[PDB]
Design a protein around this ligand. Sequence first.
Ligand SMILES: *C(=O)c1cnc2ccccc2n1
Ligand SMILES: *C(=O)c1cnc2ccccc2n1
Ligand SMILES: *C(=O)c1cnc2ccccc2n1
Ligand SMILES: *C(=O)c1cnc2ccccc2n1
Ligand SMILES: [Cl-]
Ligand SMILES: [Cl-]
Lengths: 8, 8
Amino acid sequence: XAXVXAXV
Amino acid sequence: XAXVXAXV
DNA sequence: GCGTACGC
DNA sequence: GCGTACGC
Ligand SMILES: *C(=O)c1cnc2ccccc2n1
Ligand SMILES: *C(=O)c1cnc2ccccc2n1
Ligand SMILES: *C(=O)c1cnc2ccccc2n1
Ligand SMILES: *C(=O)c1cnc2ccccc2n1
Ligand SMILES: [Cl-]
Ligand SMILES: [Cl-]
């Protein structure tokens, strides 16, 4: 759920 | 040489 | 000449 | 519920 590299 | 995650 | 950045 | 960010 976090987006820092994927954001899902 | 670039530093964006290691910076060497 | 090597690896940092988060949870809906 | 998945992976982005650069070259001295
Ligand atoms: C987001 O909160 C989050 C948490 N755990 C995960 C596990 C696997 C894929 C994506 C995820 N996203
Ligand atoms: C993004 O691609 C990504 C990959 N691994 C991680 C680990 C810890 C925090 C954030 C991250 N983001
Ligand atoms: C920095 O310019 C740079 C370029 N290539 C590398 C290869 C392996 C380790 C570190 C490196 N740093
Ligand atoms: C830092 O840990 C890191 C790792 N892989 C990369 C690939 C492309 C650009 C920058 C990167 N930085
Ligand atoms: Cl949980
Ligand atoms: Cl070269």
